[PDB]
Amino acid sequence: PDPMMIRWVNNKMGSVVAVPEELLGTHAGVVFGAGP
């Protein structure tokens, strides 16, 4: 539930990136497929 930090976690299965909900409306979600 962080305001502006984007998590990267890499385990033995794969590696995923979590984005907080509060950043999806911003310009940071254009790569992740949310956008303005």
Q: How far is the CB of 33 from other proteins (least distance, A)?
A: 16
Radius of gyration of the chain (CA): 11
Among candidate residues 27, 10, 4, 8, the one with its CA nearest the CA of residue 18: 8
x/- letters, 1..36, toward other proteins (CB under 8 A): -x-xxxxxxxxx-xx-------x-xxxx-------x
Query: How far apart, in whole angstroms, are the C-alpha atoms of residue 29 and residue 10?
Result: 21
For the CB of residue 36, give the shortest distance to other proteins in the complex, in Å: 4
Residue ranges that bind other proteins, judged by CB under 8 A? 2, 4-12, 14-15, 23, 25-28, 36
